[PDB]
Design an enzyme around this catalytic site. Structure first.
Site, short mmCIF file in Angstrom:
data_model
loop_
_atom_site.label_atom_id
_atom_site.label_comp_id
_atom_site.label_asym_id
_atom_site.label_seq_id
_atom_site.Cartn_x
_atom_site.Cartn_y
_atom_site.Cartn_z
N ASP B 151 0.86 -1.19 0.00
CA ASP B 151 0.00 0.00 0.00
C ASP B 151 0.89 1.24 0.00
O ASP B 151 0.95 2.02 0.95
CB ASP B 151 -0.97 0.01 1.19
CG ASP B 151 -2.08 1.03 1.03
OD1 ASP B 151 -1.80 2.21 0.75
OD2 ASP B 151 -3.26 0.65 1.20
N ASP B 178 -6.59 -9.10 4.76
CA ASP B 178 -7.82 -9.77 4.36
C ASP B 178 -9.03 -9.14 5.04
O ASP B 178 -10.08 -8.96 4.41
CB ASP B 178 -7.72 -11.25 4.70
CG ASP B 178 -8.37 -12.13 3.66
OD1 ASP B 178 -9.51 -11.84 3.25
OD2 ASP B 178 -7.72 -13.12 3.26
C1 LIG Z 1 -6.53 -2.74 -0.90
N1 LIG Z 1 -5.64 -3.94 -0.84
S1 LIG Z 1 -4.09 -3.89 -0.16
O1 LIG Z 1 -3.53 -5.20 -0.19
O2 LIG Z 1 -3.44 -2.81 -0.82
N2 LIG Z 1 -4.36 -3.46 1.47
C2 LIG Z 1 -3.37 -3.40 2.49
N3 LIG Z 1 -2.16 -2.89 2.10
C3 LIG Z 1 -1.19 -2.83 3.04
C4 LIG Z 1 -1.33 -3.23 4.37
C5 LIG Z 1 -2.55 -3.75 4.83
C6 LIG Z 1 -2.71 -4.21 6.28
C7 LIG Z 1 -1.92 -3.59 7.39
C8 LIG Z 1 -2.21 -2.43 8.04
C9 LIG Z 1 -3.43 -1.61 7.70
C10 LIG Z 1 -1.25 -1.84 8.97
C11 LIG Z 1 -1.35 -0.55 9.53
C12 LIG Z 1 -0.42 -0.04 10.40
C13 LIG Z 1 0.70 -0.80 10.78
O3 LIG Z 1 1.57 -0.18 11.68
C14 LIG Z 1 2.84 0.17 11.28
N4 LIG Z 1 3.09 0.39 9.96
C15 LIG Z 1 4.35 0.74 9.61
C16 LIG Z 1 5.42 0.89 10.51
C17 LIG Z 1 5.17 0.66 11.85
C18 LIG Z 1 3.87 0.30 12.24
F1 LIG Z 1 3.65 0.09 13.54
C19 LIG Z 1 0.86 -2.09 10.27
C20 LIG Z 1 -0.12 -2.58 9.37
O4 LIG Z 1 0.08 -3.85 8.89
C21 LIG Z 1 -0.81 -4.39 7.94
O5 LIG Z 1 -0.53 -5.54 7.65
C22 LIG Z 1 -3.57 -3.83 3.84
F2 LIG Z 1 -4.78 -4.32 4.17
N1 ANP Z 2 2.65 7.94 12.96
C1 ANP Z 2 1.90 8.95 12.51
N2 ANP Z 2 2.28 10.21 12.82
C2 ANP Z 2 1.54 11.23 12.37
N3 ANP Z 2 0.43 11.20 11.63
C3 ANP Z 2 0.08 9.94 11.34
C4 ANP Z 2 0.75 8.79 11.73
N4 ANP Z 2 0.10 7.66 11.24
C5 ANP Z 2 -0.92 8.15 10.58
N5 ANP Z 2 -1.00 9.52 10.60
C6 ANP Z 2 -2.00 10.36 9.96
O1 ANP Z 2 -3.25 9.71 10.05
C7 ANP Z 2 -3.99 9.94 8.83
C8 ANP Z 2 -5.01 8.84 8.65
O2 ANP Z 2 -4.35 7.57 8.85
P1 ANP Z 2 -4.76 6.28 8.02
O3 ANP Z 2 -5.72 5.50 8.84
O4 ANP Z 2 -3.52 5.49 7.59
O5 ANP Z 2 -5.47 6.82 6.71
P2 ANP Z 2 -4.67 7.06 5.40
O6 ANP Z 2 -3.46 6.19 5.37
O7 ANP Z 2 -4.23 8.55 5.35
N6 ANP Z 2 -5.62 6.76 4.05
P3 ANP Z 2 -6.18 5.16 4.05
O8 ANP Z 2 -5.02 4.22 4.01
O9 ANP Z 2 -7.08 4.96 2.77
O10 ANP Z 2 -7.04 4.90 5.35
C9 ANP Z 2 -2.92 10.01 7.75
O11 ANP Z 2 -3.36 10.79 6.65
C10 ANP Z 2 -1.73 10.65 8.47
O12 ANP Z 2 -1.65 12.05 8.22
#
Ligand code: A1AHE
Ligand code: ANP
Ligand code: ANP
Ligand code: MG
Ligand code: MG
Lengths: 275, 312
Positions: B151, B178
């Site tokens: 993503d 999923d």
């Molecule tokens: C439309 N189809 S898609 O396949 O593109 N959708 C998807 N894409 C990509 C991922 C996923 C699921 C996912 C999510 C939503 C997720 C969110 C936050 C997260 O926290 C951190 N992130 C980065 C660094 C440190 C963290 F702590 C870990 C996460 O881990 C995950 O696995 C999807 F559903």
């Molecule tokens: N670690 C972080 N520090 C600051 N802002 C954050 C952080 N994580 C997320 N955000 C903000 O939170 C907003 C919404 O988060 P998120 O739920 O990931 O939606 P999104 O990634 O912007 N779009 P979508 O993936 O379709 O839901 C983002 O647009 C960022 O600006």
């Protein structure tokens, strides 16, 4: 106004949760109610009037398988008041709690859902958002359909012409609904396709497209006609006639799907012949 | 890893900060402010009172079997092993009151989505540093964990005043992917045309997603469909038609003359519709635009602080 509710008469209470077009709170209004704060806070004049007309149509509906639609407030912001329903939704039962229903009960749920949809269609009401989230089991026995109609507030306007957009889940949307290419995509037959997805849920215990983990893949492929629910996931105890009715309701082409009198008759018919 | 002294110092410091953090509880968090919301979650600036630390807490409400939720919480703990200057810091993940909480490093600059809205357009010379950071983070994910981001888009590229550019919201958990896919509906899409049609061709998919983003951030507008004629001089389509256009029509490209030729070729190599002809990380890391942008001396931190209205 007609079937309008004044400002401070509703006790707004605990937040329940958010869906495709609003946020639901438990509330009080001569008893318990569901108060859906709509996602259209400021509506255009033409929109608000069309919404009043739609509320007038919905307020006339009464059926044992239909949640009562009670009214709307306009302040503090636009909302909907409906029958509150103790007990979980069909989605909670099938996909969260994993309630073990017997086939007799699964068929009964399908039959009651078809009853409610038949009534809604006889009154010329398109549900638009049929899904297991909007099917409740009241006292675990009666089936109650909610969140039907309300087209004027499921989209947002710029004058008298209204925009049209997809909302919430994609699993229950017919291909023509996905595509938006056809002039008016929403019809009795779109509700029939959603009902077929509900039948899939009932007869497989699963949501469709369980293997696919890409939302946009589902949108594209289902809209193009490249992807359909895998009916081989249907359980062994599922009657053959129910499988064939499911496949009939799920036809890629809108015109080929049956209407709900025929669907209801099929379900009752097959409810007789049973182990 | 391949860190300079500043990056290595900062990561060692982060881990030692993580040491003050124990078992994460709902009661131990004080809400400060809202940061943003998306299709599935809502994010808050919070204070972890036990350690005094300040975090970004993402909350996702999923109506799913408890077993699935527990598997998601389990899979998410791998984020403890994902330490890089190009990956957002992870503090912990837990479940409480019906919602999954993911606690992250707070990035005071926000996402490049927000920064784009505050900037109108992001200059090519900034997008070069952004491209370097995104390529390197995707590379770290693939080479240390065999993870593809899944993503890539402006919302999931985070930035901060200290200059850093980090990836976020990547697919570490398959069950979470999923679960998310069975719900809310977007209005645009950054999905590659091969992913929209079936099997995904390794990280190439991500790379397309990067290129698309780089176009959006460069012209200040999501580039599907491209500007007809009048819109371009200034220097809504339904979701299914957008996906159809991505799959069946040519890929978007930068407007010529206004951007350098190397950058045009970079985004065009990133946006090839055939995933095999499309450039991979190996190839992009040495592309003309990237050598040039790696050379150029840019104050990303100052540009960001000016764009959002902050101080140093
Ligand atoms: C439309 N189809 S898609 O396949 O593109 N959708 C998807 N894409 C990509 C991922 C996923 C699921 C996912 C999510 C939503 C997720 C969110 C936050 C997260 O926290 C951190 N992130 C980065 C660094 C440190 C963290 F702590 C870990 C996460 O881990 C995950 O696995 C999807 F559903
Ligand atoms: N670690 C972080 N520090 C600051 N802002 C954050 C952080 N994580 C997320 N955000 C903000 O939170 C907003 C919404 O988060 P998120 O739920 O990931 O939606 P999104 O990634 O912007 N779009 P979508 O993936 O379709 O839901 C983002 O647009 C960022 O600006
Ligand atoms: N009449 C009701 N009584 C009790 N709970 C309800 C009622 N209507 C909705 N809910 C619950 O409120 C929450 C949000 O509902 P809602 O906003 O309608 O989203 P949804 O039903 O899942 N999809 P949709 O109805 O198409 O928007 C869910 O947990 C529902 O089960
Ligand atoms: Mg509902
Ligand atoms: Mg994000």
């Amino acid at each position: 106004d007609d079937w309008e509710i004044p400002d401070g008469q509703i006790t707004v209470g605990q937040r329940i949760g958010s869906g495709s077009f609003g946020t639901v709170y438990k509330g009080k209004w001569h008893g318990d109610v569901a108060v859906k704060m709509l996602n259209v806070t400021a509506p255009t004049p033409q929109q608000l009037q069309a919404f009043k007309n739609e509320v007038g149509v919905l307020r006339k509906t009464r059926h044992v398988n239909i949640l009562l639609f009670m009214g709307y407030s306009t302040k503090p912001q636009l909302a909907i008041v409906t029958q509150w329903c103790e007990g979980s939704s069909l989605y909670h039962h099938l996909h969260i709690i994993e309630t073990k229903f017997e086939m007799i009960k699964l068929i009964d749920i399908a039959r009651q859902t078809a009853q409610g949809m038949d009534y809604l269609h006889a009154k010329s009401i398109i549900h638009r958002d049929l899904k297991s989230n909007n099917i409740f089991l009241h006292e675990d026995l009666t089936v109650k359909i909610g969140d039907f109609g309300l087209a004027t507030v499921k989209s947002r306007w710029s004058g008298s012409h209204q925009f049209e957009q997809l909302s919430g889940s994609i699993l229950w949307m017919a291909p023509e609904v996905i595509r938006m290419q056809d002039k008016n995509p929403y019809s009795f037959q779109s509700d029939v396709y959603a009902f077929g997805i509900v039948l899939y849920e009932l007869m497989t215990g699963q949501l469709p497209y369980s293997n696919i983990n890409n939302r946009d893949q589902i949108i594209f492929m289902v809209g193009r006609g490249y992807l359909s629910p895998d009916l081989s996931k249907v359980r062994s105890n599922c009657p053959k006639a129910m499988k064939r009715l499911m496949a009939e309701c799920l036809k890629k082409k809108r015109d080929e799907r049956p209407l709900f009198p025929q669907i209801l008759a099929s379900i009752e018919l097959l409810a007789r012949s049973l182990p | 890893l391949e860190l300079d002294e500043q990056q290595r110092k900062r990561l060692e410091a982060f881990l030692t900060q993580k040491q003050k953090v124990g078992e994460l509880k709902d009661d131990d968090f004080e809400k400060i402010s809202e940061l943003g919301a998306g299709n599935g979650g809502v994010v808050f600036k919070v204070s972890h009172k036990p350690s005094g630390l300040v975090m970004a807490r993402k909350l996702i409400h999923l109506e799913i079997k408890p077993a699935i939720r527990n598997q998601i919480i389990r899979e998410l703990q791998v984020l403890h092993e994902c330490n890089s200057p190009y990956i957002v810091g992870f503090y912990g993940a837990f479940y409480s009151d019906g919602e999954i909480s993911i606690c992250m490093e707070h990035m005071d600059g926000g996402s490049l989505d927000q920064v784009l809205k505050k900037a109108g357009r992001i200059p090519e010379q900034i997008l070069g540093k952004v491209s370097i950071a995104v390529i390197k983070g995707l590379t770290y994910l693939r080479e240390k964990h065999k993870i593809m981001h899944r993503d890539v888009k402006p919302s999931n590229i985070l930035v901060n005043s200290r200059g850093e550019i980090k990836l976020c919201d990547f697919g570490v958990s398959g069950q979470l992917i999923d679960a998310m896919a069975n719900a809310f509906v977007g209005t645009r899409s950054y999905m590659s045309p091969e992913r929209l049609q079936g099997t995904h061709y390794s990280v190439q998919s991500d790379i397309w997603s990067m290129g698309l983003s780089l176009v959006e951030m460069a012209v200040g507008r999501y580039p599907i469909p491209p500007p007809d004629a009048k819109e371009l001089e200034l220097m809504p389509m339904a979701i299914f038609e957008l996906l159809d256009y991505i799959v069946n029509e040519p890929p978007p490209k930068l407007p010529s003359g206004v951007f350098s030729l190397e950058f045009q070729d970079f985004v065009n190599k990133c946006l090839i519709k055939n995933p095999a002809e499309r450039a991979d990380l190996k190839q992009l890391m040495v592309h003309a635009f990237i050598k040039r942008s790696d050379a150029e001396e840019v104050d990303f931190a100052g540009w960001l602080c000016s764009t959002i209205g902050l101080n140093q």
